[PDB]
Amino acid sequence: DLAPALQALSPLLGSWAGRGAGKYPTIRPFEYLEEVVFAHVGKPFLTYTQQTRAVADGKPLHSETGYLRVCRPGCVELVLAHPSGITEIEVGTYSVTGDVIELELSTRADGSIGLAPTAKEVTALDRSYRIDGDELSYSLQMRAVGQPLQDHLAAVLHRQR
Ligand code: HEM
């Protein structure tokens, strides 16, 4: 059974696939393909995994894995591990407007970043997610490696059968 706390976020459940792009002042721009799965085990959190790969040659780029907790309806904690040696807790809120869910999260809202000894220096991450029917879109802003908070990613995914 779905935990009551997750009712508003039930449209996230399932498999999502699509494409996005990214940039940062210290790197060259890039694009990627993305696969996401949201699932649950009957508690007040979703499980979440992401895999991305290069559009050109399908080489694995970034992945992330963890949990989207509901901290009472309307509140979210996104808890993630990254294979780059970084952990992330983003905190925020969401709203339901018919078939549209808007989630706004940030490490800067009493969240966390952890850096392994060999990780790049990331100090903030902000995420804006929109689920509109069978479309999931997002942007991610990053403060890292001497640069102010600014876009690093954005993508559009579609619900898979
Ligand atoms: C869809 C997800 C993502 C993709 C496809 C992606 C892709 C890239 C690519 C291709 C680069 C440049 C090449 C490289 O350094 O490997 C890069 C750089 C970077 N990314 Fe990401 N990234 C993603 C998510 C993230 C996230 C979530 C973080 C932070 C936790 C992050 C932090 C960085 C940093 C710090 C740089 C290095 C900048 C530098 O050396 O100056 N990325 N990313």
CATH number at 6 reads 2.40.128.20
C-alpha 84 to ligand 1 mean position (Å): 9
Give the method used: X-ray
Question: Cα separation of 57 and 68, whole Å?
Answer: 31
**Count of H-run helices and E-run strands, the chain:** 0, 11
Range of the domain at 8: 1-161
**What is the three-class DSSP state of 102?**
strand
Residues with CB under 6 A from ligand 1: 22, 24, 26-27, 30, 32, 34, 52, 61-62, 82, 86, 88, 120, 122, 125, 142, 144-145, 152-153
- Whether the CB-CB separation of 34 and 19 falls below 8 Å is answered with yes
- Neighbour count for residue 94 (Cβ, 10 Å): 19
19 Cβ contact list (under 8 Å, min separation 6)? 31, 32, 33, 34, 55, 155, 156
Task: Count structural domains, the chain.
Answer: 1
- Neighbour count for residue 16 (Cβ, 10 Å): 21
User: Which of 27, 53, 63 should be mutated for ligand 1, with most atoms under 8 A from CB?
Assistant: 27
